Write a protein that binds this ligand. Sequence first.
Ligand SMILES: Nc1nc2c(ncn2[C@@H]2O[C@H](COP(=O)(O)OP(=O)(O)OP(O)(O)=S)[C@@H](O)[C@H]2O)c(=O)[nH]1
Ligand SMILES: [Mg+2]
Length: 193
Amino acid sequence: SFINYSSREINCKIVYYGPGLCGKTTNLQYIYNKTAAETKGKLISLSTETDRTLFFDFLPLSLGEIRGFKTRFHLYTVPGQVFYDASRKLILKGVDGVVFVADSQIERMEANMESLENLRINLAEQGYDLNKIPYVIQYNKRDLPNAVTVEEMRKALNHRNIPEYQAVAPTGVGVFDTLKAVAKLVLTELKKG
Ligand SMILES: Nc1nc2c(ncn2[C@@H]2O[C@H](COP(=O)(O)OP(=O)(O)OP(O)(O)=S)[C@@H](O)[C@H]2O)c(=O)[nH]1
Ligand SMILES: [Mg+2]
């Protein structure tokens, strides 16, 4: 987080992580579409001249408040396909909370596990610890006939029983619940230290 004690402004960063095509961008699109105009900024895509179609997303929002400050949450996604580790590492810098978006399709379980381990490693490689940071897991794509059962998703991907939400990101199932859960965890940490 960045706290400016003179201007009384706090900026928090939430990163949506997970394997290729798992639903990260779709989460932010639904959040943008369904949030009141007065509490959201603009959802934008970003890429660079070096790889102009390697897109990730940025969306600023007003969620909860810390008394005596203006607090804004900046939501980011990452490029989840395996090759793009360097991009994921750039985006994770300064993260305050993480949402791991798992693709419930059975064919994508290995990719879910690879991406979750990559999250843990990348957090360690910038001095963070996944076990301590505000962190919520989303089991997305619950609508698909090849989705793994929720119990099996939990046993495979949520060994520490952190908060978990079923989702269908394009229709909004679970999307705001996931966001509000991680944002509350981040705010609680701000109020602590
Ligand atoms: N059936 C179904 N399709 C979904 C769901 N969530 C996302 N999708 C679809 O999956 C595809 C990829 O979603 P997207 O949100 O773009 O992935 P991403 O995680 O951002 O992917 P990347 O940028 O790391 S490669 C899209 O076609 C989107 O509509 C879901 O819950 N159910
Ligand atoms: Mg995307």
